[PDB]
Curated annotation (Swiss-Prot):
Inhibited by sulfhydryl reagents. The gene is ACP1. GO terms for cellular component: cytoplasm; cytoplasmic side of plasma membrane; cytosol; extracellular exosome; sarcolemma; synapse. SMART domains: LMWPc. It comes from the Eukaryota. Belongs to the low molecular weight phosphotyrosine protein phosphatase family. Pfam families: LMWPc (PF01451). This is Low molecular weight phosphotyrosine protein phosphatase. The modification Phosphotyrosine is found at Y128, Y129. It is an enzyme of class 3 (hydrolase).
Amino acid sequence: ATKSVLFVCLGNICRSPIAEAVFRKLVTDQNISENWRVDSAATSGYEIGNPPDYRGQSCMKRHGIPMSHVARQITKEDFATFDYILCMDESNLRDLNRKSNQVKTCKAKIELLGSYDPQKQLIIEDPYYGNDSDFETVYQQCVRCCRAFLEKAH
């Protein structure tokens, strides 16, 4: 792989594992998975070691997208190694810019994933205190933003 994207949320259990899995399927379906390094991570240590929110798995089973992930927190190395760090909401973004300024090498462009949505839904909102319709909304946003991001990065 010589391209790489890291999807990021606060816990790495609801949103970023879905965006990760949606993007991996996309590239796999188009024969280019070998060209991409794809992963997801948390800004915080709340959920380190945990699989994705079960409500998330259920949604992704409905759409036939496999999801295997163990939550982890972003590291200093991630800012050097990834081409793109795509986050969910403004809070993630503040936190990621903060962390990016504590390291020498930040190769990554740090952006909101929803900046790629043709339907212009900027923020992918945390579904943790929501229900299945919200996980569905997050899945749908991810599909739109990942097709676009893949089509053409900014």
